[PDB]
């Protein structure tokens, strides 16, 4: 039984037809986050989506990816045993601090890039990167960041592109996805550009309350660096945002290239 090996304690978080609770593996004494999904509320198709997310999590072992340690199916309940990460989402911390210093944003994006690079080398594309699902080890400056929520992730064959469907989060969507073009790994680096812009000034590069006009902004790469807040941001921060928010997906910087950019490598 799940309850034979793990003891449940307090709720840490709440999803649709899911909760997250702190748990201890009894024999080990080790603490984990248990995502408990009510599979009574899911069709076969959506059960199988859950088993796919678990399988992709199992492929990925990396200090900046939330590690799935176990996946247990019981009558009406599925349990996903993750690393316990208690720092809350990157999103909440950006709102609390308003924006990050270049030193803190650089250390943050460097870890995201290592994680994305690992995903891309394993043939996994997240498709849905955003501060909302990047988890912090703590509220302390320089805290380790981890990628979470592989529920929309896909597997690609080498550098081959294909139409993998319309999915992700509106404000973070790549122009190639909005065009319905075949796509691959670069969609993640567009999302990294959006995340980096948000990190440095605390608002997104693309937004309109009209989703059509939001989508026209993204497809046209219509963002800028308004004064006064962007006046004190280094040209190299801007240059790395520009190479990530490149509409052409072949010209757009890769995770491997981003890790060599002077704003990452020459601190």
């Amino acid at each position: 039984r799940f309850t034979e090996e793990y003891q449940l304690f307090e709720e840490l978080g709440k999803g649709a037809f899911s909760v997250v609770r702190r748990c201890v593996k009894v024999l080990a004494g080790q603490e984990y986050a248990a995502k408990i999904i009510n599979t009574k509320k899911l069709s076969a198709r959506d059960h199988q989506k859950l088993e796919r997310e678990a399988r992709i999590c199992r492929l990925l072992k990396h200090p900046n990816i939330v590690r799935l340690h176990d996946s247990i199916s019981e009558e009406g309940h599925h349990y996903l045993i993750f690393d316990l990460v208690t720092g809350g989402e990157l999103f909440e911390d950006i709102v609390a601090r308003e924006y990050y210093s270049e030193a803190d944003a650089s250390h943050c994006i460097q870890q995201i890039l290592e994680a994305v690079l690992h995903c891309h080398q394993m043939g996994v594309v997240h498709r849905n990167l955003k501060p909302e699902n990047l988890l912090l080890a703590s509220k302390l400056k320089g805290a380790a960041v981890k990628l979470a929520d592989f529920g929309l992730a896909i597997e690609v064959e080498g550098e081959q592109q294909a139409w993998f469907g319309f999915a992700g989060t509106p404000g973070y969507l790549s122009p190639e996805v909005l065009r319905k073009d075949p796509y691959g790994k670069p969609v993640d680096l567009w999302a990294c550009g959006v995340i980096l812009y948000i990190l440095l000034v605390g608002y997104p590069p693309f937004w309109d309350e009209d989703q059509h006009r939001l989508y026209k902004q993204i497809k046209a790469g219509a963002y800028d660096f308004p004064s006064p807040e962007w006046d004190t941001v280094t040209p190299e921060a801007k240059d790395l945002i520009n190479k990530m928010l490149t509409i052409n997906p072949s010209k757009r910087i890769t995770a491997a290239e981003a890790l060599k950019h002077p704003w990452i490598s020459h601190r």
Binding site: E98, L152, G168, I198, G202, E229
Partner: peptide, 17 residues
């Protein structure tokens, strides 16, 4: 700055609710 311009950072769900 974000606060002086009254800009907001608001969480977004995925397309696939």
């Amino acid at each position: 700055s974000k606060r002086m311009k009254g800009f907001c950072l608001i969480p977004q769900q995925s397309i696939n609710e």
